[PDB]
Amino acid sequence: SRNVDKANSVLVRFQEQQAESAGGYKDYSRYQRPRNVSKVKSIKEANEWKRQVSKEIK
Amino acid sequence: TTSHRPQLEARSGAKAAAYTPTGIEHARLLPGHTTLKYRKFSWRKGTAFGRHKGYINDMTKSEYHQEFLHKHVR
Amino acid sequence: KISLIQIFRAHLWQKIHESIVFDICQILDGELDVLQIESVTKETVHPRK
Amino acid sequence: GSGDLNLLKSWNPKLMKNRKKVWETEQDLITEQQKLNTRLKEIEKERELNELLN
Amino acid sequence: SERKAINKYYPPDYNPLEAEKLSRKMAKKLKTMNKSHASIRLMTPFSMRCLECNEYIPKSRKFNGKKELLKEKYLDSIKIYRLTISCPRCANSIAFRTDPGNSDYVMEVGGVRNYSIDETLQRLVREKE
RNA sequence: AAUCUCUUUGCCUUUUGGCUUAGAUCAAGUGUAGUAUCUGUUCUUGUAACAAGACCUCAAUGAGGCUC
RNA sequence: AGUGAUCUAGAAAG
RNA sequence: GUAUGUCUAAAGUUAUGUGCUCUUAUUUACUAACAAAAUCAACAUGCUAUUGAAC
Ligand SMILES: [Mg+2]
Ligand SMILES: [Mg+2]
Ligand SMILES: [Zn+2]
């Protein structure tokens, strides 16, 4: 096994879920970016997706 | 091959002298032998061949090595 | 360890417990009047139980 | 350790376990197909008999 | 902790069934759970030559390669996999796939090796004959 | 800015940087020991009557104009 | 006709 | 003995020019550093041969 299937284990995923619930933490680099922009409503999270596009083009 | 090199010079102990010890207690440096000692001051005819008719300084040719090879290779 | 978690993979222990609890509850229901039972309650037990 | 690494890979078709899996699947399909071809010959013979009658 | 640890820590509120259901909802959005290939270490099964740069690749060379399960199956039953490496000199992608019926491999893209289900069923019956 | 070039010598001037069982093997129905996860169904009345950005002043610039 | 003599014990890294 | 390496999130700018629901592994299963010096257990209780059209 490798880092990838360790990070995608049930315990790690559950801890990610609990962290985004309990403290709002979300490493957006883990998650697929929305194809359609308009479904995103928060300015904060839309700007974070914008940051993801920025690091991708870099 | 370039990771695999001979020793051109050895590391100088002058480098280790340039900074102080860091307080690790080694077991072999615990106290021990703490006091110095000081001195006082017919059937044998039928056969064709019967009688009726050291050290050297080379380890490999020494008799011990010959005997050792005859013992341990068979 | 590997062999026994391979046997008990996908939470089979809790499944066995829940199914046997349900079986005993569901057959006690079929004898409720026979045994003069007012109610049979399957309990909401803690998952580690 | 100096052997073929691919003898420890599940996807390697050279492995005897994979060969066995392929072979058993093939035997199931082959037996079914032999049954099929027998009955299809019977269909062909039935057609021939009807044409001989007509 | 050691390699062979028996127990992992679960928080006191952890329900395994709800956790798996939540992680299943999460898995549909993670990048590395949904990419199209699995990285693997493998040996080159045969001697092959790159077509871009003519480099010879001997058998039993280890590579870091990409594994794809293909849609097609041998006799609609057995899994076929594409195995993709990249050329050590020029980094061009070389691909080959498993051939379960022959219990062998067959070349796909980027390289060359050195030296139909109905029809397959009929051929197998004739082979058995 | 005051010479330049070729041969033969002398200098080697990018001029082989350890060790062991030549380190081992040319190779195996692999065995053995670990670490993970499932996979998949599948989804959110029409008609009538009646009513209604510019500029100016103070100054962290916003409140006021029968203003347009 | 029966006296007795009683080793062990598992974890890590490679 | 489950390699390892580099990258980036930075900061805005340093003054000029919830639903449903399959599951008897239905998994894309992953790792090979580890070990390879395999033979006790074999084998039944007595050996075989066959057909050309026509002038
Ligand atoms: Mg090591
Ligand atoms: Mg090693
Ligand atoms: Zn190439």
Provide the fold topology.
This is part of a larger assembly, with chains A (58 residues), B (74 residues), C (49 residues), D (54 residues) and E (129 residues).
Chain A lengths: L2 H5 L2 H13 L20 H15 L1
Chain B lengths: L12 H4 L46 H10 L2
Chain E lengths: L15 H12 L10 E6 L4 E3 L5 E2 L4 E13 L3 E9 L6 E7 L4 E6 L1 E3 L3 H12 L1
Antiparallel strand pairs in E: 1-4, 2-3, 2-8, 4-5, 5-6, 6-7
Bound molecules: magnesium ion (2 copies) and zinc ion (ZN).
Chain A binds three RNA strands through helix 3.
Subcellular location (chain C): Nucleus
Protein name (chain C): Pre-mRNA-splicing factor 8
Termini separation of chain B: 41 Å
**Biggest interface pair, residues each?**
D-E, 19 and 28 residues
Bound molecules: magnesium ion, zinc ion
Share of β-strand residues of chain B: under 5%
User: Spatial order of the strands in the main sheet of chain E?
Assistant: 1-4-5-6-7
Estimate the global geometry of chain B from the Cα principal axes: elongated
Determine the structural class of chain B based on helices, strands and strand pairing: mainly alpha
Radius of gyration from the alpha-carbon trace of chain E, in angstroms: 21 Å
Beta-strand residue percentage of chain E: 35-45%
Q: What summary fits the major beta sheet of chain B? A: none
Radius of gyration of chain B: 33 Å
Helical content of chain B (DSSP H or I, runs of 4+): 10-25%
Q: Structural class, from helix and strand content of chain E?
A: alpha+beta
Task: Give the N-terminus to C-terminus distance of chain E in angstroms.
Answer: 60 Å
Percent of residues in helices of chain E comes to: 10-25%
**What count of helical segments of chain E does DSSP give?**
2
Largest sheet of chain E: 5 strands, antiparallel
Indicate the overall shape of chain E: extended
The ordered string of helix (H) and strand (E) elements of chain B is HH
Q: Give me the count of strands of chain E.
A: 8
> What's the count of strands of chain B?
0
Characterization of this structure:
The structure is cut from a larger assembly and holds chains A (58 residues), B (74 residues), C (49 residues), D (54 residues) and E (129 residues). With 49 residues, chain C is an all-alpha fold. Chain C has helices at 2-7, 12-29. Chain C is 49% helix and 0% strand. Chain D has one helix and no strands. In chain E, strand 5 (78-86) and strand 6 (93-99) form a beta hairpin. Chain E is built from two helices and eight strands, in the order H-E-E-E-E-E-E-E-E-H. By secondary structure, chain E is α+β, with helices and mostly antiparallel strands. Chain E has a five-stranded antiparallel β-sheet, with no helix packed on it. A three-stranded antiparallel β-sheet of chain E has the order 3-2-8, with no helix packed on it. The complex binds magnesium ion (2 copies) and zinc ion (ZN). Zinc ion (ZN) binds next to loops of chain E. Chain A binds three RNA strands through helix 3. Chain C: This is Pre-mRNA-splicing factor 8. Chain C: It comes from Saccharomyces cerevisiae (strain ATCC 204508 / S288c) (Baker's yeast).
